[PDB]
Amino acid sequence: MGVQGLWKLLECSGRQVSPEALEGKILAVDISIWLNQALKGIENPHLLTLFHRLCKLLFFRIRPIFVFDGDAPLLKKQTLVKRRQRKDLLKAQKQQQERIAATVTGQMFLESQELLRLFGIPYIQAPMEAEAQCAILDLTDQTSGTITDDSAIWLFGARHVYRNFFNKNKFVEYYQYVDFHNQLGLDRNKLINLAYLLGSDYTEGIPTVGCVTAMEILNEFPGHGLEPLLKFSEWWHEAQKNPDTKVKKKLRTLQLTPGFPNPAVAEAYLKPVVDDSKGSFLWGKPDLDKIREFCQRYFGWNRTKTDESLFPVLKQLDAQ
């Protein structure tokens, strides 16, 4: 999700840790990555995965806050419209394609929230981007960080990220921004400029521009904030207009969108819509009896089958 493979660049800034390290931490959990994965495709396997995942969290005495997406921002809605209409090649025919998609994500929102309530796990509906709201819970010190596999959080200014926390590999990667800012020399603004080139949810990139081509462009036009891309654009708009060899001749062959770099994109990552207010989050003891019913209704699980998974979690919670 987000950018094509920003994770590849950050590999070397990631300490591996044991789930046991996360014990006691308040952590934002991004559920929107799960919702999206499950939207494509045994009955209710999405809920089963959520069920297991919740057990892992509570078993390791993590106090998670689930964050669901609010309204999609303008740039996102626009870039999804261009890109879906670039893949194909009536006006109310796609309006029905978005209405069925909106009920399916609508049920899945409700089903997940039910399960969370039952496990005493608090959730919030972010205003805009969950990732951004998770990022601001991070910055306000309301969480000790975010559990997500979406590299986008970094662009919304996340400090602490736990990645691959739900994997068949089962090595939890812990990243802090501070460590990749010092060890790979990669700041927030550089990561944003990379969005502009590699392409993101807020902007399509430049077609033939990979991790390597992109980094070359930022090293070729050193600057602060958006300056590097502004100089790149100026030079390119000037090495187009006037028809004498130079090292980064590769760039002359690239063809960018007219308004690039549109500062609206940087603005959306830098000053996103979020709830800065200090919230009162609570954590309930899981309603064993109501989870048994849920598992009966959704998985067709007898009590015992539910109990097999649930008890180890509960007994594991009743030590400090």
Author numbering: 1 to 41, 50 to 97, 750 to 903, 911 to 987
The authors write:
Here, we report four crystal structures of the human XPG nuclease domain (XPGn) in the absence and presence of DNA. The overall fold exhibits similarities to other flap endonucleases but XPG harbors a dynamic helical arch that is uniquely oriented and defines a gateway.
For crystallization, we introduced the D812A mutation to abolish the XPG nuclease activity. Two versions of the protein were purified that differ in the presence or absence of extra residues at the N-terminus. Comparison of F1 molecules where the arch is fully ordered shows that α6 can adopt two distinct conformations by pivoting on its C-terminal end. In the open state, the α4 and α6 backbones lie ∼14 Å apart and define a gap of ∼11 Å, while in the closed state α6 approaches α4 by about 3 Å. In contrast, in the closed state, W34 flips into a looser hydrophobic environment and inserts between α3 and α6, which both shift in opposite directions.
